[PDB]
Symmetry: C2
Subunit: 420 residues, 2 copies
Amino acid sequence: NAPTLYEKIQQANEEAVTRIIQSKPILVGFDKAINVMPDMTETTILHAGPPITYENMCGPMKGAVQGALVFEGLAKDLADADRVARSGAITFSPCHEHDAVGSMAGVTSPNMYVHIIKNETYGNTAFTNLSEQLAKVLRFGANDQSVVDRLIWMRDVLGPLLHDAMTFCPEGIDLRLMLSQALHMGDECHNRNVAGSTLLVQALTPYMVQTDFSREQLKEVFEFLGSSDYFSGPTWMGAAKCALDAGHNVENSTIVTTMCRNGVEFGIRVSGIGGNHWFTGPAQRVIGPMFAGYTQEDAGLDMGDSAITETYGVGGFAMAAAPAIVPLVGGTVAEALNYSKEMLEITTKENPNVTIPVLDFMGIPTGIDVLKVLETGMLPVINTAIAHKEPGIGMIGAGLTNPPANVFNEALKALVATIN
Amino acid sequence: SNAPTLYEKIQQANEEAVTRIIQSKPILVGFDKAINVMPDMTETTILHAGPPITYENMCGPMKGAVQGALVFEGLAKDLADADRVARSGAITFSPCHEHDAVGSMAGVTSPNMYVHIIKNETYGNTAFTNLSEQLAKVLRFGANDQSVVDRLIWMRDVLGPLLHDAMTFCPEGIDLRLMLSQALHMGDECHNRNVAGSTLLVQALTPYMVQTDFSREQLKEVFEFLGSSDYFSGPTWMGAAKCALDAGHNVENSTIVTTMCRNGVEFGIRVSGIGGNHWFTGPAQRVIGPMFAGYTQEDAGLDMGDSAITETYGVGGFAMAAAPAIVPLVGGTVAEALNYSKEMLEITTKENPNVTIPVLDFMGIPTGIDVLKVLETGMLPVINTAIAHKEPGIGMIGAGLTNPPANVFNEALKALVATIN
């Protein structure tokens, strides 16, 4: 009594999405990437998006890698760094291929500090760097003395104090739970992190104080953390990565387990294909509110791993939860309420642990299924920060984008061919 | 001719009054023992929520409050004794409202409790409120074990002083209208759901507490205390609202409500054009809503507390729409909550642009409940509040929707038509 092919996929997607939903990413500590991540070398630099060579990277990402190389000691300055990167001496590699995710340029170097996030349920581990805090920052390609000065402080004090702080928190911090409180306080955990960041520092505060650091280091670190609302940003991405990784490599699943971009190409991974097989197409423009005297002409293409957030069910998929981002991202609140409802049409089921009050507490729409995106013709709606096409400069606005279509086509083809 | 006519003079006065309210900017500047900073305090003076009320006529839970308080202040050896002292002529019982303060639930506030000191940056008037004790077994609900009096002492021996000291490292103060601003974009409504506000406040306070001379060991238990409940900023918003509202009080000819409060027996309001501490009073009402399991509506007491200053300001139940998280706690439908915040506009003078509700396309909260419009529409202020056991100390046993009583507005109007030169 054999099962039908479409029936295989239904079963696989149920297995896949159950693992995603039942995942309980726990924040366990912090440590230099080199000390704690897989396949790391002192000459490895990780970045956001699918694979790409340095020569092909876009302005901002190059800038971030130059900034990074100088932070590492590997270069006396920017002009030098570019020479060093171009030389074959550096190994470049996506975060995703090292069980990590990076925000924006997503450049992460051996002695940057990272979140250590462990899946309570299924045992896998995810990693992600810390938010610098301002707008003029490495993850946007800026790379002043000021910028590397701040990387240094983070390596030399912030990192160490968080490492020591989690030492006094043997239980870890349950990120799904905190994520779910966040969506009840008007965040979608992608471009709105206000509530999430405030929960995080509340949670971290008493452990920090139990540290050997001085009152004065403590104050300046409290101040950095209240500097902007983006501190938990990376945190939610890591939880999402931890969760989605538990749903990868399931024999016949058509669930998207990764969506990322590097400012030149968008790449996806699908569960039933497994491993690091990427499907890539052109990164799209990001249409939205532009900042202080800026234009669409100035913006680079979509960039960053933050999209792992929508792949989980949050961010743009949860925009109904966060009507407050509308001025920042464009559109009506009407539409913002609608997206979460429409995303039900291309996902596999509601996540009963993360709910949205304005929608009568419906679970977030979880598990993008390539088949449904093809049949409905609805590409996932992503929200994102807009970055300048020039290195240096800052974040310059925010808006809405979609993945390219080709990518889902190519994945559909790969699947129906795998199953025989 | 426009020979300055009447309905005008009211339209003009409401403009000035609501402009004060909207433009007030309440700044949290300090903390200190009531007796050190509040107007007309004496050591034998104790404050309660709602309009004036003798002790003998107070209700179960609030009598328990003056008793716990008295034991703490050290004016009676014990509960049964306390009740004796209160009944003797040796205590002045007067409302928070008449000392520029406000009080949550029983609202009892005695000389040695610590209060927020909140000062109007625009208009320069000050308001005060006590702090959240943080548990369910708590004085504001009438409970008075040893445990409760101990926590009260802890709050005045340690927590209190810590707070006071922290705020001296912060000479700019904390801007409350801004923070409230942000809370309402984070799913709070600053009456029933206070999570966002509370988390924004403990975070702004931390840097300053750390600059203090308290031991780490002491900071440790104070954090434990601050996250034991999400209610820590609740009083803070009452104080904010009280501070703004008072600056809109005493405007000749104005029919704007500047106080709504209750003491478990009566509901009482003040109107700007009437002024001072002239109170209009009716029967406090039942609060009907979902019940905490094992409890039922005949367990409940009548509406009690000063927390309704919140809807007097434009927030709380008036902001219902901003806080879809509360629907199953406070009852009703989400569509109904959107609808109520819209409705409230026919009762109010104009939208506050500085404080807005995202889901309603960022309309400003509805400000300036106008006696005259309450009357002509027939529509009463909606207030969402906690339902509290009628017995002392049992505490919150659910929540729901209530209203002020119709009569209180009728009298208002009649007192107005009799004043307006």
